[PDB]
Every structure is written in structure tokens, then in C-alpha cells.
Amino acid sequence: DPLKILANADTMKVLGVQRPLLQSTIIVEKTVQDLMNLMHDLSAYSDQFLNMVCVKLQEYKDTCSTAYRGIVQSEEKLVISASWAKDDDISRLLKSLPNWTNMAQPDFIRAAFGKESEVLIGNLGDKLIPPQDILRDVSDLKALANMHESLEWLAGRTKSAFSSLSASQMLSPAQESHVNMDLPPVSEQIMQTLSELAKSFQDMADRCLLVLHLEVRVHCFHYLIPLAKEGNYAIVANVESMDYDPLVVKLNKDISAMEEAMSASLQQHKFQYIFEGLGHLISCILINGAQYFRRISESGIKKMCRNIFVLQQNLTNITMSREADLDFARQYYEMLYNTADELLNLVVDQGVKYTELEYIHALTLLHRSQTGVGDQTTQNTRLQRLKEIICEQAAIKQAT
């Protein structure tokens, strides 16, 4: 219930908010408001009215926590995104990156994408994600999205209440050693309880947004990691067709459905935080995933390029900018059109662009797939010469 009924469109215009707010949040904030109004009139019972504010806010906090766990627990444990957000080290890293820190302000952020991708690839780049570890229903994602906006709003309202009380009774450090104790209209303990409820509503709001940000990314791994181990990219096709992976089609539908919900539930800069960076992550997934192919054929490369194109069109349309990292992943797979020897010539002619391991894994993939090399002794020799070509390129560049 408390994360379903949204406030009517005329309540938003009153409060001056341009995004859906939960009716339950509106109700508890109205009750706090009424309590705050009575403490100015019946100032003699200010403590009692304040204790009722804290209790009702604590009740709504507990009510939201319960609703959260119901969305986020699966088989008596957290889904991956929830597990990562709850984790201190991971949440600390994510909250320290410019895409979060500068979320509201209108390539440093592209380097922050590299850090998210590194953590995600490092821990998920070789894992099969079972269905019970992700959130499929957009209903749950939408519930998370306007729990975020609602609790962030409630945190702002609760913070204003605290600061109004604080400002009326604030003393300077020089005025402490003075005679007149007066009477603090509110005890420090009601103030501390109240300011912590405000922080708690913000922490809960931040968590929901983190979960949404990570959830789309985990979905990318769920659908794209099976891509490599399909045994479907080694087919020899003398004629070309518009065959591309159903998993990629499912990912696109998944991303689009989520894009639909977030746009109506979140402020734009929260929306952009969810969907920007997916291009970088997906390209990393596809480049890193090539090392799991047993065989690759020319038709398979054509199919992966269609996969990348389909994903590119969708993300470009969602983020309103071309995901250039997807071009980088396309160019990587186009390297596999070459022969094992031509691939080495490409590195000599145009320099080192991918990591050493990415080049080594490309050549090794070609050896497992192609036939224009022969015995293992010439393969080991070509592999060792590729490393020397990379060694030389580095030493040359560091000297100039």
C-alpha cells in the first residue's frame, strides 16, 4: 500500500513538485505540519507535540523499510543490486564518483564510468545471474523510483522543521558563558531524534536510487554473459541476413521498459544517472566476453555487430547522445575478420588500442577458430611475437 497510491496532480502543484509523490508521504507530512502548527499556539505542550512528530515519522520510516525489503528480498536474501548498495565499501565508492556527486549540476565522468565498469566486470564478468538475483517486474522498479523521490522530499521537509526549531533557539559559543539559561523550547534530544529521522529518510532515498542504478547494470550481465557461451557465433553462412541474438533483443526491451518507468517517476538528472554509462559497461562486457567464445566465425562477428548496433540505437535514443564506447566494442570484433597474421600487422600499422590481454585473447580466439595458421609451434611463435610488438610500441611511446 504505502508505495502504490500516488498523490493527485493538484497536490503536486500545491507543493510545487513536478514528480509523483506517494500519498502516504503526503499524509505523514501533513500530520507533522499540523503538529508543528499547534506547538506555536499551545506552546505549553510543545514537547508532547514534538514527541508525536518523531513517533509518526519513526512509524513511517519503519513502514517504508518494511516495504523496501519486500521488493528487494527474493529467496530469503537480497538481489544483487540491493546487496551491493547495502555494502559499505561498494556504496562508498559509488557515492564518491562524479556521476553521483555532480548528479544535479548541469573526461572526468567518463573515467568514473570506467571505475564502475571495472568493479562490475571484475565481480560479474564471468557469472551466470539466476532469475532470483534480479528484479524483473518494472512495478518493483517503479515502487523504488518514487520511494526515492518521496523520501527525498520528506527528508527536505523534515530538515526544514528541524532547522526552524534550531534557528529559534540557537546560541553562539560566546553566549553560553552568560547568565540567562532561559529555557530551550525544545530539548536537545528531540532535536537529535528529529534531525536523524531527516538523515534516515535521505539515506533510504539514496539507497533506492543506488539500487535502481545498479539493477539495470546487473540486467546487462544477466542477458549478455550467456551471449558468448551460446555456440551460435561459429556458424558458416555464405549469405548474410538480419539474424541477431534474442538475448540482445530481450535486453533492449528490458532497458526500454525500465526507461519508460523511470522517466515518469524520477527527476531528469536521476534518470540520466541510471542510463548514462550503460554504453561503456556494455562495451566492456562484450570486449571482455570474447575470451569465452570457443569458436568465432565471420557470420558470428556480423551478428555481434548487429547486436551492438541494435543496442547502440536504443541507448543513443535514451541518453540523447551516441554511446561511442559501443563503437570501440564493434571495432574490437571487426579485428576478428583478419587472419592471425593480419591482426599482428594491424597492431604494427595503427598502434595499440586495446589492453594487452584483450589483444592476446583476440589472437587466441582466432587460433581456436581459424585454419590459416597450422601447427601449435607457429601459434606459440605468433603469440610471443604479438607480445613483442606490444612491448616495442610501449617502450617507443614512453621515450617520445
GROMACS .gro file of C-alpha atoms in nm:
model
  400
    1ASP     CA    1   0.000   0.000   0.000
    2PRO     CA    2   0.238   0.279   0.114
    3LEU     CA    3   0.436   0.263  -0.214
    4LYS     CA    4   0.144   0.245  -0.458
    5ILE     CA    5  -0.112   0.525  -0.419
    6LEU     CA    6   0.034   0.845  -0.567
    7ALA     CA    7  -0.084   1.196  -0.481
    8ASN     CA    8  -0.322   1.354  -0.731
    9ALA     CA    9  -0.196   1.604  -0.988
   10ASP     CA   10  -0.342   1.902  -0.800
   11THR     CA   11  -0.149   1.814  -0.483
   12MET     CA   12   0.177   1.833  -0.679
   13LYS     CA   13   0.101   2.188  -0.800
   14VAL     CA   14   0.031   2.293  -0.439
   15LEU     CA   15   0.363   2.158  -0.309
   16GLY     CA   16   0.548   2.280  -0.618
   17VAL     CA   17   0.681   1.938  -0.718
   18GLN     CA   18   0.699   1.812  -1.077
   19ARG     CA   19   0.728   1.439  -0.998
   20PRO     CA   20   0.492   1.180  -0.847
   21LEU     CA   21   0.474   1.172  -0.468
   22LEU     CA   22   0.339   0.886  -0.260
   23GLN     CA   23   0.012   0.971  -0.088
   24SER     CA   24   0.144   0.806   0.230
   25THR     CA   25   0.434   1.053   0.235
   26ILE     CA   26   0.198   1.348   0.185
   27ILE     CA   27  -0.024   1.225   0.469
   28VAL     CA   28   0.256   1.190   0.726
   29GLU     CA   29   0.399   1.528   0.625
   30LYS     CA   30   0.059   1.695   0.665
   31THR     CA   31   0.030   1.539   1.011
   32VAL     CA   32   0.375   1.670   1.105
   33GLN     CA   33   0.272   2.012   0.972
   34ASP     CA   34  -0.044   2.021   1.185
   35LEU     CA   35   0.157   1.917   1.492
   36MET     CA   36   0.408   2.194   1.420
   37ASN     CA   37   0.127   2.450   1.392
   38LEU     CA   38  -0.022   2.353   1.730
   39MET     CA   39   0.313   2.388   1.907
   40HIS     CA   40   0.328   2.758   1.814
   41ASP     CA   41  -0.019   2.819   1.956
   42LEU     CA   42  -0.024   2.578   2.254
   43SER     CA   43   0.345   2.637   2.331
   44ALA     CA   44   0.291   2.483   2.677
   45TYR     CA   45   0.265   2.133   2.526
   46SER     CA   46   0.548   2.173   2.273
   47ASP     CA   47   0.739   1.866   2.394
   48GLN     CA   48   0.432   1.644   2.357
   49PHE     CA   49   0.359   1.766   2.004
   50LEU     CA   50   0.723   1.710   1.907
   51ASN     CA   51   0.729   1.358   2.052
   52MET     CA   52   0.424   1.287   1.835
   53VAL     CA   53   0.612   1.419   1.531
   54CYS     CA   54   0.907   1.188   1.595
   55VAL     CA   55   0.681   0.887   1.659
   56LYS     CA   56   0.478   0.935   1.340
   57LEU     CA   57   0.797   0.989   1.139
   58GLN     CA   58   0.955   0.682   1.300
   59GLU     CA   59   0.641   0.484   1.216
   60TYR     CA   60   0.654   0.592   0.853
   61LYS     CA   61   1.025   0.512   0.838
   62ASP     CA   62   0.957   0.160   0.968
   63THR     CA   63   0.667   0.130   0.723
   64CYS     CA   64   0.894   0.222   0.430
   65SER     CA   65   1.178  -0.007   0.543
   66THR     CA   66   0.934  -0.298   0.550
   67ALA     CA   67   0.802  -0.216   0.203
   68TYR     CA   68   1.160  -0.187   0.075
   69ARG     CA   69   1.270  -0.532   0.195
   70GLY     CA   70   0.956  -0.681   0.040
   71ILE     CA   71   1.067  -0.554  -0.301
   72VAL     CA   72   1.432  -0.630  -0.251
   73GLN     CA   73   1.440  -0.976  -0.091
   74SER     CA   74   1.398  -1.275  -0.320
   75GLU     CA   75   1.480  -1.623  -0.191
   76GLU     CA   76   1.533  -1.506   0.167
   77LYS     CA   77   1.828  -1.295   0.052
   78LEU     CA   78   1.887  -0.966  -0.126
   79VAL     CA   79   1.902  -0.930  -0.503
   80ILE     CA   80   2.249  -0.838  -0.626
   81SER     CA   81   2.182  -0.464  -0.664
   82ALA     CA   82   2.038  -0.443  -0.312
   83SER     CA   83   2.328  -0.648  -0.175
   84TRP     CA   84   2.580  -0.414  -0.340
   85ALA     CA   85   2.407  -0.095  -0.222
   86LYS     CA   86   2.389  -0.221   0.139
   87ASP     CA   87   2.764  -0.290   0.124
   88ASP     CA   88   2.967  -0.008   0.278
   89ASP     CA   89   3.276  -0.025   0.054
   90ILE     CA   90   3.075  -0.053  -0.269
   91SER     CA   91   2.819   0.216  -0.181
   92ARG     CA   92   3.103   0.442  -0.065
   93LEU     CA   93   3.285   0.401  -0.397
   94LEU     CA   94   2.968   0.463  -0.599
   95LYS     CA   95   2.869   0.769  -0.395
   96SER     CA   96   3.219   0.915  -0.445
   97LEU     CA   97   3.211   0.909  -0.827
   98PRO     CA   98   3.135   1.231  -1.019
   99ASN     CA   99   2.824   1.085  -1.184
  100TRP     CA  100   2.671   1.071  -0.834
  101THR     CA  101   2.846   1.369  -0.673
  102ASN     CA  102   2.767   1.602  -0.967
  103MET     CA  103   2.429   1.443  -1.044
  104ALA     CA  104   2.237   1.772  -1.013
  105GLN     CA  105   2.491   2.009  -1.171
  106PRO     CA  106   2.404   2.059  -1.544
  107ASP     CA  107   3.656   1.341  -1.943
  108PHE     CA  108   3.615   1.304  -1.565
  109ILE     CA  109   3.267   1.148  -1.567
  110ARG     CA  110   3.369   0.909  -1.844
  111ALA     CA  111   3.658   0.798  -1.620
  112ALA     CA  112   3.408   0.738  -1.338
  113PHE     CA  113   3.224   0.506  -1.576
  114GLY     CA  114   3.549   0.312  -1.614
  115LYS     CA  115   3.561   0.262  -1.237
  116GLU     CA  116   3.203   0.134  -1.216
  117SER     CA  117   3.264  -0.094  -1.514
  118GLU     CA  118   3.586  -0.225  -1.359
  119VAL     CA  119   3.410  -0.321  -1.035
  120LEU     CA  120   3.112  -0.469  -1.220
  121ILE     CA  121   3.322  -0.661  -1.475
  122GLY     CA  122   3.567  -0.782  -1.209
  123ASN     CA  123   3.294  -0.942  -0.999
  124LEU     CA  124   3.024  -1.026  -1.254
  125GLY     CA  125   3.204  -1.052  -1.590
  126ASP     CA  126   3.211  -1.434  -1.577
  127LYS     CA  127   2.896  -1.511  -1.375
  128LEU     CA  128   2.561  -1.658  -1.475
  129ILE     CA  129   2.299  -1.446  -1.295
  130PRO     CA  130   1.998  -1.664  -1.197
  131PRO     CA  131   1.648  -1.510  -1.223
  132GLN     CA  132   1.603  -1.488  -0.846
  133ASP     CA  133   1.901  -1.249  -0.817
  134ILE     CA  134   1.743  -0.963  -1.017
  135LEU     CA  135   1.417  -0.766  -1.023
  136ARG     CA  136   1.211  -0.839  -1.334
  137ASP     CA  137   0.886  -0.654  -1.258
  138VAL     CA  138   0.901  -0.286  -1.352
  139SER     CA  139   0.632  -0.248  -1.085
  140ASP     CA  140   0.907  -0.305  -0.827
  141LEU     CA  141   1.144  -0.068  -1.007
  142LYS     CA  142   0.873   0.198  -1.021
  143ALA     CA  143   0.799   0.149  -0.650
  144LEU     CA  144   1.169   0.202  -0.576
  145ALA     CA  145   1.179   0.511  -0.801
  146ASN     CA  146   0.908   0.711  -0.626
  147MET     CA  147   1.006   0.586  -0.285
  148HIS     CA  148   1.330   0.767  -0.371
  149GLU     CA  149   1.158   1.091  -0.476
  150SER     CA  150   0.905   1.072  -0.191
  151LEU     CA  151   1.159   1.003   0.085
  152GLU     CA  152   1.395   1.268  -0.052
  153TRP     CA  153   1.105   1.515  -0.039
  154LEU     CA  154   1.015   1.404   0.315
  155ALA     CA  155   1.382   1.443   0.411
  156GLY     CA  156   1.372   1.803   0.288
  157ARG     CA  157   1.051   1.880   0.476
  158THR     CA  158   1.176   1.713   0.795
  159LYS     CA  159   1.506   1.903   0.763
  160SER     CA  160   1.319   2.236   0.736
  161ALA     CA  161   1.122   2.154   1.051
  162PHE     CA  162   1.444   2.081   1.243
  163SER     CA  163   1.620   2.394   1.117
  164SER     CA  164   1.319   2.613   1.204
  165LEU     CA  165   1.328   2.480   1.561
  166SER     CA  166   1.709   2.500   1.580
  167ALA     CA  167   1.727   2.856   1.447
  168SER     CA  168   1.480   2.989   1.705
  169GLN     CA  169   1.690   2.865   1.999
  170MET     CA  170   2.047   2.860   1.861
  171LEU     CA  171   2.308   3.017   2.089
  172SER     CA  172   2.659   3.121   1.993
  173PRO     CA  173   2.960   2.974   2.176
  174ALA     CA  174   3.028   3.315   2.332
  175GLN     CA  175   2.672   3.338   2.469
  176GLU     CA  176   2.700   3.008   2.659
  177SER     CA  177   2.907   3.154   2.945
  178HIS     CA  178   2.627   3.404   3.008
  179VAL     CA  179   2.377   3.429   3.291
  180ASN     CA  180   2.043   3.366   3.127
  181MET     CA  181   1.977   2.995   3.076
  182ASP     CA  182   1.623   3.094   2.964
  183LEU     CA  183   1.457   2.764   2.866
  184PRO     CA  184   1.528   2.573   2.545
  185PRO     CA  185   1.178   2.548   2.394
  186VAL     CA  186   1.286   2.203   2.275
  187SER     CA  187   1.527   1.960   2.438
  188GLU     CA  188   1.842   1.860   2.251
  189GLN     CA  189   1.714   1.501   2.247
  190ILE     CA  190   1.400   1.580   2.048
  191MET     CA  191   1.620   1.780   1.811
  192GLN     CA  192   1.866   1.494   1.768
  193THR     CA  193   1.587   1.239   1.717
  194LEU     CA  194   1.430   1.472   1.460
  195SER     CA  195   1.748   1.551   1.265
  196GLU     CA  196   1.837   1.181   1.247
  197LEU     CA  197   1.496   1.095   1.103
  198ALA     CA  198   1.566   1.351   0.829
  199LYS     CA  199   1.904   1.194   0.755
  200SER     CA  200   1.746   0.846   0.763
  201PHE     CA  201   1.488   0.945   0.501
  202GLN     CA  202   1.769   1.074   0.280
  203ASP     CA  203   1.981   0.761   0.331
  204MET     CA  204   1.682   0.543   0.240
  205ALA     CA  205   1.618   0.763  -0.064
  206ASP     CA  206   1.982   0.741  -0.176
  207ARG     CA  207   1.974   0.363  -0.135
  208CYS     CA  208   1.671   0.326  -0.362
  209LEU     CA  209   1.846   0.528  -0.633
  210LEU     CA  210   2.167   0.326  -0.598
  211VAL     CA  211   1.968   0.003  -0.629
  212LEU     CA  212   1.797   0.131  -0.945
  213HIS     CA  213   2.132   0.241  -1.089
  214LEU     CA  214   2.292  -0.098  -1.024
  215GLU     CA  215   1.984  -0.302  -1.119
  216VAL     CA  216   1.990  -0.203  -1.488
  217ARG     CA  217   2.361  -0.283  -1.490
  218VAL     CA  218   2.311  -0.629  -1.339
  219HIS     CA  219   2.045  -0.685  -1.605
  220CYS     CA  220   2.314  -0.620  -1.868
  221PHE     CA  221   2.518  -0.907  -1.723
  222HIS     CA  222   2.213  -1.134  -1.693
  223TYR     CA  223   2.140  -1.111  -2.066
  224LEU     CA  224   2.484  -1.054  -2.225
  225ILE     CA  225   2.705  -1.306  -2.038
  226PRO     CA  226   2.516  -1.602  -2.194
  227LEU     CA  227   2.593  -1.445  -2.535
  228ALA     CA  228   2.944  -1.593  -2.556
  229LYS     CA  229   2.855  -1.948  -2.449
  230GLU     CA  230   2.568  -1.990  -2.696
  231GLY     CA  231   2.758  -2.189  -2.959
  232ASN     CA  232   2.578  -1.970  -3.211
  233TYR     CA  233   2.858  -1.747  -3.342
  234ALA     CA  234   3.065  -2.017  -3.518
  235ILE     CA  235   2.815  -2.085  -3.799
  236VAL     CA  236   2.949  -2.063  -4.155
  237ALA     CA  237   2.699  -1.863  -4.361
  238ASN     CA  238   2.775  -1.783  -4.725
  239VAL     CA  239   2.474  -1.546  -4.731
  240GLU     CA  240   2.408  -1.267  -4.481
  241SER     CA  241   2.079  -1.199  -4.305
  242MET     CA  242   1.927  -0.990  -4.024
  243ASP     CA  243   1.988  -1.254  -3.756
  244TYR     CA  244   2.087  -1.114  -3.418
  245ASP     CA  245   2.069  -1.251  -3.066
  246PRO     CA  246   1.732  -1.284  -2.887
  247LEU     CA  247   1.910  -1.209  -2.559
  248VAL     CA  248   2.013  -0.871  -2.701
  249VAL     CA  249   1.653  -0.820  -2.811
  250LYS     CA  250   1.537  -0.905  -2.458
  251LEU     CA  251   1.793  -0.669  -2.303
  252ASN     CA  252   1.672  -0.385  -2.528
  253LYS     CA  253   1.310  -0.447  -2.433
  254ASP     CA  254   1.414  -0.467  -2.067
  255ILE     CA  255   1.606  -0.138  -2.090
  256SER     CA  256   1.323   0.032  -2.279
  257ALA     CA  257   1.056  -0.078  -2.031
  258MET     CA  258   1.272   0.045  -1.743
  259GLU     CA  259   1.340   0.368  -1.931
  260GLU     CA  260   0.963   0.416  -1.961
  261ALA     CA  261   0.903   0.381  -1.586
  262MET     CA  262   1.199   0.592  -1.467
  263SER     CA  263   1.112   0.886  -1.694
  264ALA     CA  264   0.769   0.923  -1.531
  265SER     CA  265   0.892   0.857  -1.176
  266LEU     CA  266   1.229   1.034  -1.143
  267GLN     CA  267   1.360   1.382  -1.197
  268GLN     CA  268   1.561   1.402  -1.518
  269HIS     CA  269   1.904   1.410  -1.355
  270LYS     CA  270   1.822   1.094  -1.159
  271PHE     CA  271   1.701   0.933  -1.483
  272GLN     CA  272   2.028   1.025  -1.655
  273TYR     CA  273   2.224   0.876  -1.364
  274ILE     CA  274   2.055   0.540  -1.424
  275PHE     CA  275   2.103   0.523  -1.801
  276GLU     CA  276   2.426   0.710  -1.870
  277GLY     CA  277   2.726   0.479  -1.852
  278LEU     CA  278   2.542   0.173  -1.984
  279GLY     CA  279   2.714   0.215  -2.320
  280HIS     CA  280   3.054   0.198  -2.153
  281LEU     CA  281   2.959  -0.101  -1.938
  282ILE     CA  282   2.802  -0.298  -2.225
  283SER     CA  283   3.106  -0.239  -2.449
  284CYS     CA  284   3.331  -0.367  -2.169
  285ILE     CA  285   3.107  -0.673  -2.125
  286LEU     CA  286   3.123  -0.751  -2.498
  287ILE     CA  287   3.500  -0.700  -2.530
  288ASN     CA  288   3.575  -0.897  -2.213
  289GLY     CA  289   3.327  -1.168  -2.314
  290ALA     CA  290   3.511  -1.258  -2.634
  291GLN     CA  291   3.760  -1.464  -2.432
  292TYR     CA  292   3.479  -1.710  -2.352
  293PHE     CA  293   3.395  -1.790  -2.714
  294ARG     CA  294   3.524  -2.133  -2.811
  295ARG     CA  295   3.498  -2.058  -3.183
  296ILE     CA  296   3.412  -1.743  -3.377
  297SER     CA  297   3.310  -1.733  -3.745
  298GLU     CA  298   3.268  -1.448  -3.991
  299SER     CA  299   2.889  -1.472  -3.961
  300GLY     CA  300   2.917  -1.463  -3.582
  301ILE     CA  301   3.111  -1.137  -3.598
  302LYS     CA  302   2.846  -0.995  -3.832
  303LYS     CA  303   2.582  -1.099  -3.578
  304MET     CA  304   2.765  -0.937  -3.285
  305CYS     CA  305   2.794  -0.616  -3.486
  306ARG     CA  306   2.417  -0.622  -3.537
  307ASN     CA  307   2.383  -0.679  -3.162
  308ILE     CA  308   2.599  -0.375  -3.092
  309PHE     CA  309   2.411  -0.165  -3.349
  310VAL     CA  310   2.070  -0.254  -3.201
  311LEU     CA  311   2.193  -0.171  -2.850
  312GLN     CA  312   2.358   0.149  -2.977
  313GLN     CA  313   2.039   0.282  -3.139
  314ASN     CA  314   1.841   0.224  -2.819
  315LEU     CA  315   2.091   0.380  -2.575
  316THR     CA  316   2.164   0.676  -2.803
  317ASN     CA  317   1.792   0.750  -2.819
  318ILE     CA  318   1.759   0.719  -2.439
  319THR     CA  319   2.063   0.925  -2.336
  320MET     CA  320   2.032   1.165  -2.633
  321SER     CA  321   2.400   1.110  -2.721
  322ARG     CA  322   2.587   0.845  -2.919
  323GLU     CA  323   2.749   0.578  -2.700
  324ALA     CA  324   3.095   0.595  -2.856
  325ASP     CA  325   3.226   0.311  -2.639
  326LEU     CA  326   2.995   0.077  -2.831
  327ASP     CA  327   3.188   0.176  -3.144
  328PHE     CA  328   3.504   0.067  -2.962
  329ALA     CA  329   3.348  -0.275  -2.896
  330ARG     CA  330   3.241  -0.301  -3.260
  331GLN     CA  331   3.594  -0.225  -3.382
  332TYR     CA  332   3.729  -0.494  -3.148
  333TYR     CA  333   3.508  -0.763  -3.303
  334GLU     CA  334   3.595  -0.635  -3.652
  335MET     CA  335   3.957  -0.723  -3.569
  336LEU     CA  336   3.847  -1.088  -3.578
  337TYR     CA  337   3.777  -1.056  -3.952
  338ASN     CA  338   4.156  -1.052  -4.005
  339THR     CA  339   4.376  -1.358  -4.008
  340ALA     CA  340   4.607  -1.432  -3.717
  341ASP     CA  341   4.893  -1.268  -3.909
  342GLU     CA  342   4.689  -0.970  -4.029
  343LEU     CA  343   4.586  -0.897  -3.669
  344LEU     CA  344   4.953  -0.853  -3.578
  345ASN     CA  345   5.001  -0.623  -3.878
  346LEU     CA  346   4.705  -0.414  -3.760
  347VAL     CA  347   4.878  -0.351  -3.426
  348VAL     CA  348   5.201  -0.256  -3.605
  349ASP     CA  349   5.024  -0.023  -3.852
  350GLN     CA  350   4.777   0.156  -3.624
  351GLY     CA  351   4.920   0.106  -3.275
  352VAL     CA  352   4.796  -0.047  -2.953
  353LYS     CA  353   4.437   0.050  -2.871
  354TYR     CA  354   4.307  -0.237  -2.654
  355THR     CA  355   4.473  -0.383  -2.348
  356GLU     CA  356   4.746  -0.644  -2.392
  357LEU     CA  357   4.519  -0.921  -2.261
  358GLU     CA  358   4.244  -0.810  -2.499
  359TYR     CA  359   4.487  -0.845  -2.791
  360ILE     CA  360   4.619  -1.180  -2.664
  361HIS     CA  361   4.265  -1.311  -2.613
  362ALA     CA  362   4.172  -1.196  -2.964
  363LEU     CA  363   4.463  -1.383  -3.122
  364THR     CA  364   4.400  -1.690  -2.907
  365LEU     CA  365   4.035  -1.680  -3.015
  366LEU     CA  366   4.148  -1.666  -3.379
  367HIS     CA  367   4.377  -1.967  -3.323
  368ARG     CA  368   4.087  -2.171  -3.180
  369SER     CA  369   3.865  -2.069  -3.475
  370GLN     CA  370   4.063  -2.019  -3.797
  371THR     CA  371   4.271  -2.263  -4.003
  372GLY     CA  372   4.523  -2.046  -4.190
  373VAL     CA  373   4.799  -2.097  -3.931
  374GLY     CA  374   4.862  -2.470  -3.888
  375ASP     CA  375   5.055  -2.639  -3.609
  376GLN     CA  376   5.090  -2.527  -3.247
  377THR     CA  377   5.457  -2.431  -3.282
  378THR     CA  378   5.374  -2.144  -3.521
  379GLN     CA  379   5.086  -2.037  -3.296
  380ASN     CA  380   5.305  -2.006  -2.987
  381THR     CA  381   5.554  -1.816  -3.204
  382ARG     CA  382   5.288  -1.573  -3.331
  383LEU     CA  383   5.154  -1.523  -2.979
  384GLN     CA  384   5.501  -1.443  -2.847
  385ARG     CA  385   5.566  -1.204  -3.137
  386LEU     CA  386   5.239  -1.021  -3.063
  387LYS     CA  387   5.366  -0.954  -2.711
  388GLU     CA  388   5.694  -0.821  -2.852
  389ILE     CA  389   5.504  -0.589  -3.085
  390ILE     CA  390   5.313  -0.456  -2.784
  391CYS     CA  391   5.635  -0.431  -2.581
  392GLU     CA  392   5.803  -0.226  -2.855
  393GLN     CA  393   5.505   0.009  -2.900
  394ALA     CA  394   5.506   0.090  -2.527
  395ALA     CA  395   5.882   0.150  -2.497
  396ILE     CA  396   5.873   0.372  -2.807
  397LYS     CA  397   5.580   0.579  -2.677
  398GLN     CA  398   5.729   0.625  -2.329
  399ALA     CA  399   6.050   0.763  -2.480
  400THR     CA  400   5.883   1.018  -2.711
   0.00000   0.00000   0.00000
